[PDB]
Short mmCIF file of C-alpha atoms in Angstrom, two decimals:
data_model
loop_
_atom_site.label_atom_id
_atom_site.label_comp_id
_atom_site.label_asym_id
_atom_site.label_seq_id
_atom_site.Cartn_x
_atom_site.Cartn_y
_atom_site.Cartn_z
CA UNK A 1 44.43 -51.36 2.25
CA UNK A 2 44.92 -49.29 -1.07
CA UNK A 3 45.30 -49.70 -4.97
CA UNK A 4 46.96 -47.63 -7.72
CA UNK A 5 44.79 -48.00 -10.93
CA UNK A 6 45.91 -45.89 -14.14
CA UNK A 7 43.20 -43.43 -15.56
CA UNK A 8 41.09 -45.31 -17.84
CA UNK A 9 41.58 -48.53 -15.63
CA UNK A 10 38.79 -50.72 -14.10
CA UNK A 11 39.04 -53.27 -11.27
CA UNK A 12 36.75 -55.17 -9.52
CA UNK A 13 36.67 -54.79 -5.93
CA UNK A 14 35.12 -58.16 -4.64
CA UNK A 15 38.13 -59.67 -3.83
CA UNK A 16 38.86 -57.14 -0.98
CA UNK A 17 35.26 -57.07 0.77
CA UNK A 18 35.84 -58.03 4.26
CA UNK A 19 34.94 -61.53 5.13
CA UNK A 20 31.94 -60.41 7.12
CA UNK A 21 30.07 -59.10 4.72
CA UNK A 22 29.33 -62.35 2.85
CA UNK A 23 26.04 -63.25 1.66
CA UNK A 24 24.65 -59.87 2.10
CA UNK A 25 23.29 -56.85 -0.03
CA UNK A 26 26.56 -54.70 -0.98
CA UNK A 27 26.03 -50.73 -1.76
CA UNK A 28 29.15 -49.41 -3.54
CA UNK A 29 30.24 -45.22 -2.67
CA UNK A 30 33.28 -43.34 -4.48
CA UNK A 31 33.71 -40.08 -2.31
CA UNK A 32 34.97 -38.37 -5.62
CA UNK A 33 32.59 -40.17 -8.24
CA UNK A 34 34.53 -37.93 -11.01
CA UNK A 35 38.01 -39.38 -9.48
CA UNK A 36 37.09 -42.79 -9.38
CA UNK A 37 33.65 -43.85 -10.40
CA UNK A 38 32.17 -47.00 -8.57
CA UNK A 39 29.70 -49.47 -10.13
CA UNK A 40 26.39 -51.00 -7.76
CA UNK A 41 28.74 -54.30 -8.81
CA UNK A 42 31.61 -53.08 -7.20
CA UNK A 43 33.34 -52.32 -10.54
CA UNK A 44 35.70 -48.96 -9.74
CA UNK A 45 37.32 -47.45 -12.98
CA UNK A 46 39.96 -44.74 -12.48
CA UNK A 47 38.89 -41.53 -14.33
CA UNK A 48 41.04 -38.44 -13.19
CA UNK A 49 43.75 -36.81 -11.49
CA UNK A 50 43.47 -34.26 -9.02
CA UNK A 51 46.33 -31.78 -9.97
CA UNK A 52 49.30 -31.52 -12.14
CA UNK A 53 49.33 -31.78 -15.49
CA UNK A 54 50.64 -29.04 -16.61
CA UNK A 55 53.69 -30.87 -14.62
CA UNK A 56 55.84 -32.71 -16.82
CA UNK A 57 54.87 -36.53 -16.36
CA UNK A 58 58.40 -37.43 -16.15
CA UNK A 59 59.05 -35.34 -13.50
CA UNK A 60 55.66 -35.60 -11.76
CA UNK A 61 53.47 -38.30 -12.83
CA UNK A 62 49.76 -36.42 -12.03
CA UNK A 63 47.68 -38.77 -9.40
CA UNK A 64 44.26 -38.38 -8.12
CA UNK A 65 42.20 -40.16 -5.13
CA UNK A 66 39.35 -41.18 -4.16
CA UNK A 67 37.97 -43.29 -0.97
CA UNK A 68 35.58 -45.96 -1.99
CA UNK A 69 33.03 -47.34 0.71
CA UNK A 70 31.40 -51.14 0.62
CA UNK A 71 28.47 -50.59 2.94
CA UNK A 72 26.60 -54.09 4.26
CA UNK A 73 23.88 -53.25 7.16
CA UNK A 74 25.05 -50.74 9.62
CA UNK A 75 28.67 -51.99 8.59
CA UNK A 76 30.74 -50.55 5.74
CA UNK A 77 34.61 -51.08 4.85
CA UNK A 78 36.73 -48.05 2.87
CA UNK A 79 39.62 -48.52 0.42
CA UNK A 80 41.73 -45.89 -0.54
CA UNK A 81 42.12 -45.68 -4.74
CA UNK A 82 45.20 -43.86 -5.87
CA UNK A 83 44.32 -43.02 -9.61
CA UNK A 84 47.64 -42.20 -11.84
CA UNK A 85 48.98 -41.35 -15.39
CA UNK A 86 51.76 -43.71 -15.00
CA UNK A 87 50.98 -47.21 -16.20
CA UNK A 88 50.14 -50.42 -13.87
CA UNK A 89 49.07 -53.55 -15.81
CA UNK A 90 51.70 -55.54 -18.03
CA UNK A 91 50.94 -55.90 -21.45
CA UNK A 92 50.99 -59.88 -21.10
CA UNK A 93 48.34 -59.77 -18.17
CA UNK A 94 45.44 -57.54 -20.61
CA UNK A 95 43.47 -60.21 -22.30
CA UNK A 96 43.74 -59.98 -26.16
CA UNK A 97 43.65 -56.50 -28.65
CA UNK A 98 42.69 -58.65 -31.67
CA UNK A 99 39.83 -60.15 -30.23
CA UNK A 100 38.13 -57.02 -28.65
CA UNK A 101 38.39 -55.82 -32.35
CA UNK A 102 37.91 -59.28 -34.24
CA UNK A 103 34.32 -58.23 -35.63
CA UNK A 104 35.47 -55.01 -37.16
CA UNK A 105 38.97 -55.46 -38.55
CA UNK A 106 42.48 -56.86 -38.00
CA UNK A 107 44.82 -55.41 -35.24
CA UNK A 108 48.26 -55.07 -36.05
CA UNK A 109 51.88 -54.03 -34.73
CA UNK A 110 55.33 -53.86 -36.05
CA UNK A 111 57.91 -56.74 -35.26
CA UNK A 112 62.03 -57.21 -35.44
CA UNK A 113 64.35 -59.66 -36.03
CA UNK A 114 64.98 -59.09 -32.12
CA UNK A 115 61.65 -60.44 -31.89
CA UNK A 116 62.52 -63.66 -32.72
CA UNK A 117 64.90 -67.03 -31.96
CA UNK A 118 66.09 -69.11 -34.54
CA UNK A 119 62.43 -69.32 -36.12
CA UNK A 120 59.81 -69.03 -33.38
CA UNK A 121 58.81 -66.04 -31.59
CA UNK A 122 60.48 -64.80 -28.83
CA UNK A 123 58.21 -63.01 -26.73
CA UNK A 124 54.34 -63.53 -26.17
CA UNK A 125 53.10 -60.23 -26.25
CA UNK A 126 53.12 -60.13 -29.64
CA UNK A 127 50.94 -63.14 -30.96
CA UNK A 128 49.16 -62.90 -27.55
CA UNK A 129 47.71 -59.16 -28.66
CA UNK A 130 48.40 -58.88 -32.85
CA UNK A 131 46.98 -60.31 -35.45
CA UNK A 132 49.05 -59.01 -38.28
CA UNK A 133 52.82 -57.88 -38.09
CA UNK A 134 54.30 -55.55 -40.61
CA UNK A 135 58.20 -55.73 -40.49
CA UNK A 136 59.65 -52.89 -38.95
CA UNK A 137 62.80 -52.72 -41.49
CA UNK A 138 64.03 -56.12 -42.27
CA UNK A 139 61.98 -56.43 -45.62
CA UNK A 140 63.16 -52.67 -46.65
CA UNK A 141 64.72 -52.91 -50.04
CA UNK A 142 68.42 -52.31 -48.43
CA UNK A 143 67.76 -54.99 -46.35
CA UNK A 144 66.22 -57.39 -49.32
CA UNK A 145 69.23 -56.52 -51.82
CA UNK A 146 72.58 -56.18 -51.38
CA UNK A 147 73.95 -55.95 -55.21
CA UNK A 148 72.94 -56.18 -58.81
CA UNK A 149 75.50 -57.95 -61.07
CA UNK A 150 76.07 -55.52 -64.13
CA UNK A 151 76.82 -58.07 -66.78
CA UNK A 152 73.86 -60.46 -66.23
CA UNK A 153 71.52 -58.40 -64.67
CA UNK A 154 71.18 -61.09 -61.40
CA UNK A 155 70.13 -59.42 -58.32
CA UNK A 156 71.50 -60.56 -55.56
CA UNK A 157 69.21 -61.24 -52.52
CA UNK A 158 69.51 -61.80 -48.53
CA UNK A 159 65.98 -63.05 -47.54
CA UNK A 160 66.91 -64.87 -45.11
CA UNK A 161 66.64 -62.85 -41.88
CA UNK A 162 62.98 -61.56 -43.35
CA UNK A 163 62.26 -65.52 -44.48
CA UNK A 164 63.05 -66.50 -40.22
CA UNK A 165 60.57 -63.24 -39.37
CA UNK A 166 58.05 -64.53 -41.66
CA UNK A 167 57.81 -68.13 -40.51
CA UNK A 168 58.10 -67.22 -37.01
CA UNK A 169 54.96 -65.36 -36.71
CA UNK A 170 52.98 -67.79 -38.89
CA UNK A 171 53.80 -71.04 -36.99
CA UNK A 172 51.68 -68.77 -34.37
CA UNK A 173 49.00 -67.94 -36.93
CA UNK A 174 50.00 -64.67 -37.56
CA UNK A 175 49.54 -62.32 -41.20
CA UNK A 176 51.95 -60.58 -42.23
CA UNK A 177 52.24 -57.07 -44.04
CA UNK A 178 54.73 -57.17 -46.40
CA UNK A 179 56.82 -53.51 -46.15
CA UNK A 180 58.37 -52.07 -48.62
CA UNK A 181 59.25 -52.99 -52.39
CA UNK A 182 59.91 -49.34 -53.86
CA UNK A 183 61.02 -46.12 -51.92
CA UNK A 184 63.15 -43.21 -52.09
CA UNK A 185 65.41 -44.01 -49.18
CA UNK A 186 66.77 -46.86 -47.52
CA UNK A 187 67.49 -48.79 -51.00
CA UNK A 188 70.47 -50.57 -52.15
CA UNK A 189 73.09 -48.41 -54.40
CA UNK A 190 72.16 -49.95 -57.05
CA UNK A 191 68.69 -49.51 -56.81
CA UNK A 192 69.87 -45.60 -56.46
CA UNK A 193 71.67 -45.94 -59.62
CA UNK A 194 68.66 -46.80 -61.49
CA UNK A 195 67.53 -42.91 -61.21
CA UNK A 196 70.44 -42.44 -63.99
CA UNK A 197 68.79 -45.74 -66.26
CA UNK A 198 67.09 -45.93 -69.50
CA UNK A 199 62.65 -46.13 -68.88
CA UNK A 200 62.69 -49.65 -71.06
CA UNK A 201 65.30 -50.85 -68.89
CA UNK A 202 64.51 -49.76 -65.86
CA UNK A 203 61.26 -51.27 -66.10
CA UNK A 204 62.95 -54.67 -66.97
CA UNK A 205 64.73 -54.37 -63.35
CA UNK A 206 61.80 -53.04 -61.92
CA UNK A 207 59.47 -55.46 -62.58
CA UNK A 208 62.29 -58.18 -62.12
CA UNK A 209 63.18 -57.09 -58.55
CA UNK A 210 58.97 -56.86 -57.69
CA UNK A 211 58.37 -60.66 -59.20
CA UNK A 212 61.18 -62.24 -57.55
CA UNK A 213 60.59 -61.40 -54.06
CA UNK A 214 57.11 -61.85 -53.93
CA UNK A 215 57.73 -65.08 -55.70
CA UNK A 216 60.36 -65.83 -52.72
CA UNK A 217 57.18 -65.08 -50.05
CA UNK A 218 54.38 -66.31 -52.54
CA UNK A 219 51.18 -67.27 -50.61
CA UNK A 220 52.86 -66.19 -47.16
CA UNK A 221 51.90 -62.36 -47.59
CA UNK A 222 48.76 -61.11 -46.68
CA UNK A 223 49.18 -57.81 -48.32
CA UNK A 224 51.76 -55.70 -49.92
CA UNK A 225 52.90 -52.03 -49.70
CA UNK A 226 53.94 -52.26 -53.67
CA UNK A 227 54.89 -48.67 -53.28
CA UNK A 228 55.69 -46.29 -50.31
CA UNK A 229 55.56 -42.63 -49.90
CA UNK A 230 55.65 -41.20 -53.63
CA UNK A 231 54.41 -37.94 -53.00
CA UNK A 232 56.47 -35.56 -51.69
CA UNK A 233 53.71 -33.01 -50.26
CA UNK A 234 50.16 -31.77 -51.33
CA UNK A 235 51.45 -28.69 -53.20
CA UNK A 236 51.31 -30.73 -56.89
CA UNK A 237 48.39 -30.03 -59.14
CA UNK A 238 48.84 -33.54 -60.72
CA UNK A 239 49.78 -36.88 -59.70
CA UNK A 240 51.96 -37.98 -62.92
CA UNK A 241 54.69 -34.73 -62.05
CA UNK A 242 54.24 -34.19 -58.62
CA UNK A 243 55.88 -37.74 -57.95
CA UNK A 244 59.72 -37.60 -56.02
CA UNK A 245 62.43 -37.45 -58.17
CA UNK A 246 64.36 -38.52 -55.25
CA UNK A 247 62.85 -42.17 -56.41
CA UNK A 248 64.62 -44.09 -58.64
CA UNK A 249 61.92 -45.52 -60.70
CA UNK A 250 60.11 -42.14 -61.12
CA UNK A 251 63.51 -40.62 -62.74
CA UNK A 252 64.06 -43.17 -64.78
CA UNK A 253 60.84 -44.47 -65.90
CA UNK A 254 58.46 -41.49 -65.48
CA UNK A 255 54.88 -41.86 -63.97
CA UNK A 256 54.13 -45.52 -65.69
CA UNK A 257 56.42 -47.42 -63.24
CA UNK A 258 53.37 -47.52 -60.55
CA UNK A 259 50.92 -49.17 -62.98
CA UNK A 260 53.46 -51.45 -64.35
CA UNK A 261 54.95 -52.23 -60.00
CA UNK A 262 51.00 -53.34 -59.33
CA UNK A 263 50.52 -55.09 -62.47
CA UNK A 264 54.19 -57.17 -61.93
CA UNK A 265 53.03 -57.62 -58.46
CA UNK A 266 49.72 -58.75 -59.25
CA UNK A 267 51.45 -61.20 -61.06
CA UNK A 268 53.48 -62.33 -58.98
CA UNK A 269 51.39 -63.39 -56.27
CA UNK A 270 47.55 -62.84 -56.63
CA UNK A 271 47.39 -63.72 -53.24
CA UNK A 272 48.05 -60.82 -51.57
CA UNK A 273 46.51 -57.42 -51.21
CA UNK A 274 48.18 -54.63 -53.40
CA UNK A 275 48.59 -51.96 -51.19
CA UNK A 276 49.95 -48.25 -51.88
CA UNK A 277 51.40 -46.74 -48.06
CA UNK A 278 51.61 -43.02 -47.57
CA UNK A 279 51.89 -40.29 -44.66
CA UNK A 280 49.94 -36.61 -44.06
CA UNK A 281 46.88 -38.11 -45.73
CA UNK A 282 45.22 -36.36 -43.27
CA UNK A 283 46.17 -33.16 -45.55
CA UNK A 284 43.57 -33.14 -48.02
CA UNK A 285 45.97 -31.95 -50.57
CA UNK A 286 47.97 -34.62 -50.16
CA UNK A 287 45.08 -37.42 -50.15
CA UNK A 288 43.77 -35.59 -53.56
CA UNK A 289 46.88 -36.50 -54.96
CA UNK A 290 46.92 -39.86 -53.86
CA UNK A 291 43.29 -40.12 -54.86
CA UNK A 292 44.25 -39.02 -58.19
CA UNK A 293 46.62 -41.88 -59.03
CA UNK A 294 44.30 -44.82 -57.49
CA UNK A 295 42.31 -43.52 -59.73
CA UNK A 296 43.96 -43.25 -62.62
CA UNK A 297 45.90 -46.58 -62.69
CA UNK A 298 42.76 -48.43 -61.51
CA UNK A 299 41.15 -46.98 -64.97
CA UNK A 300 44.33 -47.75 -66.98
CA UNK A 301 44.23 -51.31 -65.46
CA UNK A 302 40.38 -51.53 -66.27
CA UNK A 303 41.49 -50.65 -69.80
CA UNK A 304 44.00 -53.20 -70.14
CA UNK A 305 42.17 -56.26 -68.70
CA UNK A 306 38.68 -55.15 -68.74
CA UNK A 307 37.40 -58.71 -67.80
CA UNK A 308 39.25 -58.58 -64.42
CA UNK A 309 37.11 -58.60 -61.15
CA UNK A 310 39.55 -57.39 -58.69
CA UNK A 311 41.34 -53.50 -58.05
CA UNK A 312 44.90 -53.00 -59.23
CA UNK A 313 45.79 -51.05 -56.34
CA UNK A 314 43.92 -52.49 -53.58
CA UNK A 315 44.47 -50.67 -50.80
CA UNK A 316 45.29 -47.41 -49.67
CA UNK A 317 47.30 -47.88 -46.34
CA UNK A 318 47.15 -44.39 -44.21
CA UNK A 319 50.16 -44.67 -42.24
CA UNK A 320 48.32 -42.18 -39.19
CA UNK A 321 51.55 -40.92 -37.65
CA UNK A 322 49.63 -38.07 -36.00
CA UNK A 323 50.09 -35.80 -33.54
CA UNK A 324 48.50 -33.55 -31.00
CA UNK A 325 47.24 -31.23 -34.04
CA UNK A 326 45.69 -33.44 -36.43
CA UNK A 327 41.25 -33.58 -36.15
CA UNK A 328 39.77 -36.18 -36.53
CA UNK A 329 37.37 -34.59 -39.06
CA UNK A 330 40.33 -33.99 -41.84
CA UNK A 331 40.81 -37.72 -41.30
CA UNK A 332 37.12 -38.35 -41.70
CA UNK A 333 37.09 -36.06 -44.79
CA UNK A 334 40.26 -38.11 -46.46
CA UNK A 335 38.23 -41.59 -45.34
CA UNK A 336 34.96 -40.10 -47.33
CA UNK A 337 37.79 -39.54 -49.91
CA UNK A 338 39.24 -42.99 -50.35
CA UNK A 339 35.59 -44.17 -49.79
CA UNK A 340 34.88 -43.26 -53.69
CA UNK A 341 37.43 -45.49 -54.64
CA UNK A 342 35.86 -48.27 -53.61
CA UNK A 343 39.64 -49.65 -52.32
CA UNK A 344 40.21 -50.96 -49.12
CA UNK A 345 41.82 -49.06 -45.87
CA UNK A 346 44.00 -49.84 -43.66
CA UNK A 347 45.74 -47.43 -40.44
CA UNK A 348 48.76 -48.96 -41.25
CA UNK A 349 51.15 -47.13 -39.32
CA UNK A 350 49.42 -45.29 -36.25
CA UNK A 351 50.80 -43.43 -33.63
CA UNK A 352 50.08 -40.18 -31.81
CA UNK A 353 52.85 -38.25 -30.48
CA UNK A 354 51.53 -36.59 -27.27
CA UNK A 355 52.29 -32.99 -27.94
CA UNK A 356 52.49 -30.97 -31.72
CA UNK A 357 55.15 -32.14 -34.40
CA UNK A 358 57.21 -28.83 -33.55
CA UNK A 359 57.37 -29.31 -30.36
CA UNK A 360 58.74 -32.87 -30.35
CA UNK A 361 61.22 -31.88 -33.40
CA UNK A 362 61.99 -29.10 -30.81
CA UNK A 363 62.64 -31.39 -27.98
CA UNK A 364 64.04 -34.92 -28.67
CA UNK A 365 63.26 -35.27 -32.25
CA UNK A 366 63.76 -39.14 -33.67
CA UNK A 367 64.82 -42.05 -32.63
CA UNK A 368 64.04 -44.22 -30.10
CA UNK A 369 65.37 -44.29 -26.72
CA UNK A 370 64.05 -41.25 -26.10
CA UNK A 371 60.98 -41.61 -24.20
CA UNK A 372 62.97 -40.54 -20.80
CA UNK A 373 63.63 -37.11 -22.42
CA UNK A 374 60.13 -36.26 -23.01
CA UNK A 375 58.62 -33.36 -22.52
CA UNK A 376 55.14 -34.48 -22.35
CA UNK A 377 53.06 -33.24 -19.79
CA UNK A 378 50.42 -35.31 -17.66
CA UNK A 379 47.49 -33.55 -19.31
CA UNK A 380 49.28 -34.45 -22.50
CA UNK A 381 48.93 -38.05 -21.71
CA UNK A 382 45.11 -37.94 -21.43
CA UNK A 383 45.11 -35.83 -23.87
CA UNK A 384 46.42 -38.63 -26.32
CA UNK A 385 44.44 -40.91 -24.85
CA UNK A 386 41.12 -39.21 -25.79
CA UNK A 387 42.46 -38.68 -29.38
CA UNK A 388 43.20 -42.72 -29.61
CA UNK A 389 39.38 -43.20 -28.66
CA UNK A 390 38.56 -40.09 -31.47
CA UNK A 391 40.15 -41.89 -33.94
CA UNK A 392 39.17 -45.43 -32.97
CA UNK A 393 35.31 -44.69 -32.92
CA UNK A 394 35.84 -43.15 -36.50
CA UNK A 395 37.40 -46.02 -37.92
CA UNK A 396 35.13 -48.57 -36.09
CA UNK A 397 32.41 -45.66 -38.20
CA UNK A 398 34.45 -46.81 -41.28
CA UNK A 399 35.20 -50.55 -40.30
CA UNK A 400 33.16 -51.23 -43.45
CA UNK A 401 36.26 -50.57 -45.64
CA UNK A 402 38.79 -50.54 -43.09
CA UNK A 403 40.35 -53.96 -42.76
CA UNK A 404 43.27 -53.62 -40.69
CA UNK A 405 44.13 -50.84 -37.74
CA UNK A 406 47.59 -51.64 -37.10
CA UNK A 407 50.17 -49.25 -34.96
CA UNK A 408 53.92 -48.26 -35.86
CA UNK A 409 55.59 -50.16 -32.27
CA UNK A 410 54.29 -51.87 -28.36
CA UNK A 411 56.16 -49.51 -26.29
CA UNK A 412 57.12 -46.46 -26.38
CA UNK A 413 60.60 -46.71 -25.34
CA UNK A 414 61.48 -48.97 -28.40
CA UNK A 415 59.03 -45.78 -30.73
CA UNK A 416 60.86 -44.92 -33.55
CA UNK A 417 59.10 -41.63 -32.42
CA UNK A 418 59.98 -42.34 -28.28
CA UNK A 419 60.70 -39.07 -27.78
CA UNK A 420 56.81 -38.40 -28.26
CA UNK A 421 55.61 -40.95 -26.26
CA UNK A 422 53.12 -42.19 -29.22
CA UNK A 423 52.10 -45.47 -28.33
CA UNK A 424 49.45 -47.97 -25.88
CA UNK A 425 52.16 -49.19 -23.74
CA UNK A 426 55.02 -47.49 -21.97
CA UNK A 427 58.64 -48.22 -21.33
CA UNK A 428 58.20 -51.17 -19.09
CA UNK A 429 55.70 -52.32 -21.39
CA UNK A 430 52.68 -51.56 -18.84
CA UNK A 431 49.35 -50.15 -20.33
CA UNK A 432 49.29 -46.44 -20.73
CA UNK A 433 45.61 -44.37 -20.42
CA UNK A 434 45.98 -44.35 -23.86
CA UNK A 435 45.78 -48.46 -24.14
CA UNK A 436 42.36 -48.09 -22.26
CA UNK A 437 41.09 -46.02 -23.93
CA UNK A 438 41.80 -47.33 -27.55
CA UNK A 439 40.12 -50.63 -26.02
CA UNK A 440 36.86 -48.32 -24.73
CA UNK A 441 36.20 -47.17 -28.25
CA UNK A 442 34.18 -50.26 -29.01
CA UNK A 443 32.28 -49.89 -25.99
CA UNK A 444 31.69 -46.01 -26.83
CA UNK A 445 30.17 -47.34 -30.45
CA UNK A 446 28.58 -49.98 -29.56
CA UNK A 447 26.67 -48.00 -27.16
CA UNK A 448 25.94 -45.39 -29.56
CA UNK A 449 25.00 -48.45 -31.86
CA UNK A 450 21.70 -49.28 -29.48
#
């Protein structure tokens, strides 16, 4: 004669009113309204635990209770609701993220080639829930390239596990995010090599590798990360030297490769949305940097073709892997930032670990698998959950320029931060507090809205 609802959780209760009782006037009672709230419809929602918390979840998982009473004449009926931290609902049974969200901007996720059979998609959750998918490696340069040949300069290219992603999640009318063309890590050896070329050379290669793979997806890519991660910190006083050397096209070609990546790009397939991708924009420093080049090559591109309409660099893509010490005001701030631009935004990569960034590099550090060594707390769990409903009610604030709020993974076991338990849906793929409380932020603006 009891349920188990996880915090943030609502379920209707008419199904288990006594058969007795039909056709009369109901009256609805929680005896702990701030455990479990009841609505005059007979709508409960799980709101708190009673306890732990300062317990470690794995250990522990924090619960909470509450006895609510259907009252009908001088005749009532009392069901026991055992409110938890530890997720109920499968992610297949919640009724679609994308739609909830469909007025204000995409809603993304990440997908594998694991993901998919032959070329259709081999679990539901994600087409049922996503309307975008940015590949979670297989369209990395190292996994684009394999070779260069030295004496006629042909690149050699394996699209094809990328090419089955890619038509796999459109026959389901999915976008795609195209991730990554040019990075610092995770690139072929001879992409590496080109740190040690000649500029007018390098930019040959360059803009050769950028054409020919957005040629080989042309028209299938909704928008591009041209360029990823280029700034190495917010320490630089200027965008042009404070660039990594660690990149190959920096070294070789100096600051000019990024206009001349957009412009091939652009090129290349006017279809898509140029995007530049980038962590710790929430560090002002940082996002004054980035800023700072958007700027700069969106002038020297206004220069060049001063007829054209559209941006050079379209987007700015903040990647959002926070943490349990980033404010949502700095965000705000970088947001207000970009906002001058006039680009579009995108949370292209969110995730919140549940605890600070020391504390999980203390603990489990990367990787995934990791989720059943956390040391998250129960109160940490909330916790996150509140800052998911933070952020989401500021970018719903900014859904103006924000196009697409996409997070870095579906459950937390498979996080390529697990060990921080940063995602909506936990290890068995049930809905954390966290899930319903990213899905409440509409409901919080909306009803700040009227």
């Amino acid at each position: 004669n009891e349920i188990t609802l996880t915090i943030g959780q609502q379920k209707d209760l008419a199904s288990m009113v006594p058969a007795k009782f039909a056709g009369q006037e109901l009256s609805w009672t929680s005896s702990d309204p701030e455990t479990a709230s009841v609505t005059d419809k007979g709508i409960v929602t799980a709101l708190k635990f009673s306890s732990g918390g300062a317990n470690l979840f794995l250990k522990a998982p924090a619960t909470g209770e509450a006895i609510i009473t259907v009252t009908a004449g001088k005749q009532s009926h009392s069901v026991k609701v055992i409110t938890t931290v530890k997720g109920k609902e499968d992610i297949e049974k919640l009724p679609p993220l994308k739609d909830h969200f469909k007025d204000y901007f995409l809603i993304g996720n990440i997908f594998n080639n694991r993901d998919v059979s032959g070329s259709m998609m081999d679990n539901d959750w994600l087409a049922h829930h996503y309307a975008i998918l940015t590949p979670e490696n297989h369209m990395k340069p190292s996994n684009l390239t394999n070779n260069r040949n030295e004496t006629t300069g042909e690149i050699t290219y394996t699209f094809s596990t990328a090419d089955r992603m890619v038509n796999a999640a459109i026959a389901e009318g999915l976008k795609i995010h195209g991730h990554t063309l040019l990075w610092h890590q995770q690139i072929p050896p001879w992409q590496r090599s080109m740190e040690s070329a000649a500029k007018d050379a390098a930019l040959s290669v360059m803009k050769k590798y950028i054409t020919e793979v957005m040629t080989h997806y042309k028209g299938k890519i909704y928008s591009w990360d041209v360029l990823n991660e280029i700034f190495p910190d917010g320490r630089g006083d200027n965008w042009t030297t404070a660039m990594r050397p660690e990149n190959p096209w920096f070294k070789s070609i100096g600051s000019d490769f990024v206009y001349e990546a957009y412009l091939a790009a652009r090129q290349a397939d006017p279809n898509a949305i140029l995007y530049y991708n980038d962590y710790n924009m929430d560090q002002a420093g940082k996002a004054a940097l980035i800023a700072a080049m958007v700027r700069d090559v969106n002038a020297k591109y206004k220069q060049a073709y001063p007829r054209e309409t559209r941006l050079l660099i379209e987007g700015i893509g903040m990647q959002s892997h926070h943490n349990m010490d980033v404010p949502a005001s700095n965000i705000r701030n970088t947001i207000n930032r970009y906002r001058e631009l006039g680009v579009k935004i995108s949370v292209s990569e969110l995730d919140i670990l549940c605890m600070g960034w020391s504390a999980f590099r203390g603990s489990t550090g990367q990787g995934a698998d990791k989720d059943d060594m956390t040391i998250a707390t129960n109160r940490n769990i909330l916790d996150q959950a509140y800052k998911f409903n933070e952020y989401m009610k500021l970018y719903l604030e900014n859904s103006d320029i924000i196009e697409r709020v996409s997070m870095w993974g579906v459950s937390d076991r498979y996080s390529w931060r697990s060990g921080g338990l940063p995602l909506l849906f936990d290890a068995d793929n049930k809905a954390k507090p966290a899930y319903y409380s990213f899905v409440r932020a509409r409901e919080d603006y909306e009803a700040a809205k009227a």
